[PDB]
């Protein structure tokens, strides 16, 4: 159920960002990830403007490059996993405005590569640190 669960989280988060009509974990994540997204958006502002996410291919490429640079030091923690969702939110927003061929069904592909990255690169750490219910939620819930 690993991949599917993360996929469900990545998908809930972008439906939240795109304001379109979730578990406790997901409600907790949306709230903390969105807070981080706003902070990233203003601080990395000028830098993101000079990149046009005109397609899902570009979005996937940009996501993977950014994620690789972020996690290349081998460090993994809940704070960082939360920024993954924040970044996906930034990408969907840029895609909604810049996607040349507006395919309102590419947002599922985004949730897919977000899940893929998380699963293959932090899945083991997540498990060893309590999973979503006993790791993430315990640490970020009210």
């Amino acid at each position: 159920c690993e991949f599917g669960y993360i996929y469900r989280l990545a998908q809930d988060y972008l439906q939240c960002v795109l304001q379109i009509p979730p578990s406790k974990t997901s409600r907790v994540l949306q709230n903390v990830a969105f807070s981080v997204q706003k902070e990233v958006e203003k601080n990395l502002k000028s830098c993101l403007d000079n990149v046009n996410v005109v397609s899902v291919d570009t979005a996937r490429t940009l996501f993977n490059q950014v994620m690789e640079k972020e996690f290349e030091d081998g460090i993994i923690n809940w704070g960082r996993i939360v920024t993954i969702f924040a970044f996906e939110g930034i990408l969907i927003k840029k895609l909604l405005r810049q996607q040349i061929a507006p395919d309102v069904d590419t947002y599922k592909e985004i949730s897919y590569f977000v899940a893929e990255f998380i699963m293959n690169n932090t899945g083991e750490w997540i498990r060893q640190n309590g999973g979503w219910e006993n790791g993430f939620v315990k640490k970020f819930e009210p």
Partner: peptide, 16 residues
């Protein structure tokens, strides 16, 4: 390191 490192910095920031 552009965006990647910034996200790491913010991530470690909200993790603590």
């Amino acid at each position: 390191g552009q965006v990647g490192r910034q996200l790491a910095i913010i991530g470690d920031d909200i993790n603590r």
